[PDB]
Design a protein around this ligand. Structure first.
Ligand SMILES: [Mg+2]
Ligand SMILES: [Mg+2]
Ligand SMILES: [Mg+2]
Ligand SMILES: [Mg+2]
Ligand SMILES: [Mg+2]
Ligand SMILES: [Mg+2]
Ligand SMILES: [Mg+2]
Ligand SMILES: [Mg+2]
Ligand SMILES: [Mg+2]
Ligand SMILES: [Mg+2]
Ligand SMILES: [Mg+2]
Ligand SMILES: [Mg+2]
Ligand SMILES: [Mg+2]
Ligand SMILES: [Mg+2]
Ligand SMILES: [Mg+2]
Ligand SMILES: [Mg+2]
Ligand SMILES: [Mg+2]
Ligand SMILES: [Mg+2]
Ligand SMILES: [Mg+2]
Ligand SMILES: [Mg+2]
Ligand SMILES: [Mg+2]
Ligand SMILES: [Mg+2]
Ligand SMILES: [Mg+2]
Ligand SMILES: [Mg+2]
Ligand SMILES: [Mg+2]
Ligand SMILES: [Mg+2]
Ligand SMILES: [Mg+2]
Ligand SMILES: [Mg+2]
Ligand SMILES: [Mg+2]
Ligand SMILES: [Mg+2]
Ligand SMILES: [Mg+2]
Ligand SMILES: [Mg+2]
Ligand SMILES: [Mg+2]
Ligand SMILES: [Mg+2]
Ligand SMILES: [Mg+2]
Ligand SMILES: [Mg+2]
Ligand SMILES: [Mg+2]
Ligand SMILES: [Mg+2]
Ligand SMILES: [Mg+2]
Ligand SMILES: [Mg+2]
Ligand SMILES: [Mg+2]
Ligand SMILES: [Mg+2]
Lengths: 137, 190, 75
RNA sequence: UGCUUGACGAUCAUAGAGCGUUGGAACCACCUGAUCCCUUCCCGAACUCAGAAGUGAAACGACGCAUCGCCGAUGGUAGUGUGGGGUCUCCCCAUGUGAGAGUAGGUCAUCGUCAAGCUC
RNA sequence: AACGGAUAAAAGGUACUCCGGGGAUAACAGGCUGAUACCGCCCAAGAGUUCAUAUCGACGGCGGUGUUUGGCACCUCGAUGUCGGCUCAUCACAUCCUGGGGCUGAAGCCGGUCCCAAGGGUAUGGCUGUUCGCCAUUUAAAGUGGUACGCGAGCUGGGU
RNA sequence: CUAAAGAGUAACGGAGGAGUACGAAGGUGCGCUCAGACCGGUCGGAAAUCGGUCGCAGAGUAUAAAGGCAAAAGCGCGCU
RNA sequence: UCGAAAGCUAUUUAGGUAGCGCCUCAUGUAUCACUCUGGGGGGUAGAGCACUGUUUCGGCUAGGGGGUCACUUACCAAACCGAUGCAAACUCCGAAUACCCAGAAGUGCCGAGCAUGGGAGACACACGGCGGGUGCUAACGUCCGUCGUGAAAAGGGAAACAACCCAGACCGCCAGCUAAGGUCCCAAAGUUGUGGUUAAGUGGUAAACGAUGUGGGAAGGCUUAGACAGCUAGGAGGUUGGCUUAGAAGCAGCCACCCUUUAAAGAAAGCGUAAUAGCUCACUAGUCGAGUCGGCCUGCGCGGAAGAUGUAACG
């Protein structure tokens, strides 16, 4: 389960998610990628589930990159607790996703296999995704 | 094979360029370099997109046709839509036969299914870096550069110094001192 | 263990901007350190207050070998 | 008439760094010695004094070179004031504005006062 | 230091209570919301002798309802009676029986699951104030909810 | 920090400190420049003191953070 | 005639009060606002990685750990190099606006500004937009900033509907023009004109996801050397592949899956036997005679879609 493993601050402001992902939108490293076409949050649990679904399908051969890291801590108020009396305590970690961000990458597999494994991973994810091949410029 | 038709464009700015991509599908573009001043042009989106399916579209000199004024240019940079992926803008560098240019030439890994590591050791080719950048004269601009794996074993790493410049091209990062790892055979992912 | 404290706002910053008429003694900048430095006709206080020593108009300038922003009073 | 050297400035990297070549007539530096002035929490290393045997090695100055650094458009993109709209966590249209990054490229500074020497 | 410091000098109980007020502010019910709850779906590693989808289904994802625990404090404090029982109900369908079907890891008998279907029907006792639950014995079945957790200007008063 | 590039700006919002210290740790004149790394060197070792190169403030600034700091605002000495 | 406030600061204060803010009146006095031009500072949006943290790959390499017990590395890893992301309490950068100042035209309803004084009220705010914290980017939630409205504002529209849209009612008129919103009937005004789309009453409530619904566009593969579909016929050996197995012999389990025969048949998908198996996918021959196949971008639709008094999610 991906986590920053240490941070300067425990808790963060909620913030917003407004960009169009002009960085992280290219297929580096690999040759096929899962690219987010919509906007949202990826929790660590979702990223791991997509990783496992994707890795189990390209069994015995391939290299996979996770280009999404959940570095944003998300707090929750417990049940039967009123408003106020402090923020609340970190529950899980999310990655902010803008349209265009590359989430996963693969190489060493055929394009037909890559599309199959990315469809498996994209069904675990709460975002609209698309399959992209590496491009020259 | 590479022909591109353009029209001189005089309406500039955010609103003008958004109207180009929205109403009458066209691509803003600029031509600079050489000995002339920059020239703002427009291109058909379907025309530039079709040209870019060619793997050599970036390492080959194009013949821009700016309203009847043919001119040899290189596709220097492209701006793509981050989500949809279509081309939003294109930078054309005027190619001059006397002045050296710098371009990113795609790599062609050959002898992949004959490598020592792949068969005798059962490794994976694992393309690390494609798209070497080269500084050469326009006549020496190659369409691609072979990596000719062939004799690569389970621990070998293909560096930038192990390639062969075709005629007179110079690998720019090699000149700086960065021996980039082009590829490496490693053990199969278990 | 918890929070809920803060100190009063110090009302720092530029009090007279470029081209403003100044009298001698007028406070030009309130600052913590020397974000601005004292140029011609400008004094420096204990707390790095920039004040006018002469009458004129404020001139802001960046100059010198260190890239210090200077406050000067010109005629 | 211009150049060279030195001191002080303007400016503060397009001016810097690195590498290489060069200057000793003068200037400057290294240099000689330390009784004298003065100095070392020890040491003439530095500071200081009296000099001119030696040398441009170090430093400094000048010249060259894009290796680094620094500068850097055009176009586009992001954002954004106002008015309007939508599918309204976020966007779009009209109009005004408009980066940062990156790309093409640029840079081995420019100027002033005074003193000495030389040149013409 | 309750740091613009009421006095030099000061803690508690009230179900024995009382006054002035407040729906400016809680408890009930209503409302908004839907984290939670319940119901459904998407993907499908796997279980199922083999076989993902007869029956299930991890890791994850998307909804619906208003339905539990909650959040809020909008109505009511010049008073909107509470839990349970009794009597009498009315509606929904996410159906417990009866009716019609598809698939089945459906031989038959009996089942499992899903679709359609709301016409009618849908226990009596022991214990407990109980709703519930456990137990006994039936039944074709002993449905799940809404109705001020339906119903005290209809009864009860065991609980509170 | 929130705080929306003048100021200000709330929450039982997110984080830390104070209720001191110093007659020198103040004034002035003079002088100096850190941290760290590498190499060489008796005990000596990762790390003590010494020498050299790099280093150019990544140190220091009584104390929390922020903003500053070469005329150093950092360090030493004499006189006060 | 004018016309607020529900703010700041303090308060045994919090639903009270006090100064300031905002209203009014009077007196005095000369400023003020809008815009243009010019001069400023900034560290936000965005961006970025130069610092501080946090990422992910790869290369090179300390150092750590193995085999020696003096040499070499099974295995982790500092630094550096390159690629690659994030940040309210990061910044090498960096707007728009906003704010401060100066000069200038016109307009101020005859004044805006300021000062002094008489009289207050008010210090429970609410919603909507935008920027945020908090909450679940839940609440007609809560807390700030900022603007608009209500408060204290009627009229018209949104069915009804403080806070939304248009517009600010001195009085009268059985005059006209417009705004938002509308024009088949209720109910004033086009059953207007032109060109398309939809068949779902979608319009007139919803997601992931599913689907030969249907319109447009740009490409691609095969194709009168016969494309796709349909129909007929064929679909072989060593060999029962080494081995394993009660029996694997084409498919259960590991590995191989090569070669010839021919217009073609991979050591055989699924119904599935105790192994041969029955059917049969790839492949070909004939017939057939003109299109055919599935991907992309996109407009409008479909399913997903269950609730309680009565149709009841166009009034
Ligand atoms: Mg615009
Ligand atoms: Mg000497
Ligand atoms: Mg020399
Ligand atoms: Mg630049
Ligand atoms: Mg720029
Ligand atoms: Mg007090
Ligand atoms: Mg009693
Ligand atoms: Mg009473
Ligand atoms: Mg109330
Ligand atoms: Mg309640
Ligand atoms: Mg009520
Ligand atoms: Mg009453
Ligand atoms: Mg039903
Ligand atoms: Mg019934
Ligand atoms: Mg009947
Ligand atoms: Mg009973
Ligand atoms: Mg009895
Ligand atoms: Mg009841
Ligand atoms: Mg009653
Ligand atoms: Mg009675
Ligand atoms: Mg501010
Ligand atoms: Mg501001
Ligand atoms: Mg040592
Ligand atoms: Mg050492
Ligand atoms: Mg000090
Ligand atoms: Mg009035
Ligand atoms: Mg008090
Ligand atoms: Mg930002
Ligand atoms: Mg002005
Ligand atoms: Mg009050
Ligand atoms: Mg108040
Ligand atoms: Mg308020
Ligand atoms: Mg409210
Ligand atoms: Mg309220
Ligand atoms: Mg009132
Ligand atoms: Mg109205
Ligand atoms: Mg009406
Ligand atoms: Mg009519
Ligand atoms: Mg008609
Ligand atoms: Mg409808
Ligand atoms: Mg056929
Ligand atoms: Mg639909």
């Amino acid at each position: 389960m991906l986590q920053p493993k240490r941070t300067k601050f425990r808790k963060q402001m909620t913030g917003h998610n407004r960009g169009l992902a002009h960085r992280g939108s290219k297929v580096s490293f690999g040759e096929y990628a899962l690219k987010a076409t919509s906007r949202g949050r990826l929790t660590a649990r979702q990223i791991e589930s997509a990783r496992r679904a994707l890795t189990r399908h390209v069994k015995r051969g391939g290299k996979i990159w996770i280009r999404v890291f959940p570095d944003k801590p998300v707090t929750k108020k417990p049940l039967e607790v009123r408003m106020g009396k402090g923020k609340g305590g970190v529950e899980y970690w999310v990655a902010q996703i803008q349209p265009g961000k590359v989430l996963y990458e693969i190489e060493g597999v055929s394009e037909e296999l890559a599309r199959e494994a990315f469809a498996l991973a994209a069904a675990k994810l709460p975002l609209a995704t698309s399959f992209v091949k590496r491009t020259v410029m | 094979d590479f022909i591109l038709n353009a029209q001189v464009r005089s309406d500039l700015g955010k609103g003008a360029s958004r109207r180009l991509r929205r109403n009458a599908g066209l691509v803003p573009a600029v031509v600079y370099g050489g000995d002339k001043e920059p020239q703002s042009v427009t291109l058909e989106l379907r025309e530039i997109a079709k040209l870019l399916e060619n793997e050599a579209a970036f390492s080959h000199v194009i013949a821009l046709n700016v309203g009847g004024a043919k001119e040899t240019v290189l596709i220097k940079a492209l701006q793509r839509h981050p989500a949809k992926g279509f081309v939003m803008h294109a930078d054309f560098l005027r190619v001059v036969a006397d002045h050296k240019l710098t371009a990113h030439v795609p790599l062609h890994f050959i002898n992949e299914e004959v490598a020592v590591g792949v068969k005798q050791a059962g490794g994976e080719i694992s393309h690390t870096i494609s798209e070497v950048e080269v500084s050469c004269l326009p006549k020496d601009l190659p369409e691609f550069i072979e990596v000719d794996m062939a004799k690569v074993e389970l621990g070998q790493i293909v560096h930038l110094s192990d390639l062969k410049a075709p005629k007179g091209v110079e690998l720019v990062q090699l000149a700086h001192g960065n021996d980039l790892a082009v590829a490496n055979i490693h053990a199969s992912r278990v | 263990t918890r929070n809920g404290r803060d100190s009063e706002s110090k009302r720092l910053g530029v009090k007279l901007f470029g081209g403003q008429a100044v009298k001698a003694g007028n406070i030009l900048v309130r600052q913590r350190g020397t974000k601005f430095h004292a140029g011609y006709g400008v004094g420096l206080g204990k707390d790095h207050t920039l004040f006018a020593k002469v009458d004129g108009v404020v001139k802001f300038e960046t100059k010198g070998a260190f890239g210090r922003k200077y406050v000067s009073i010109v005629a």
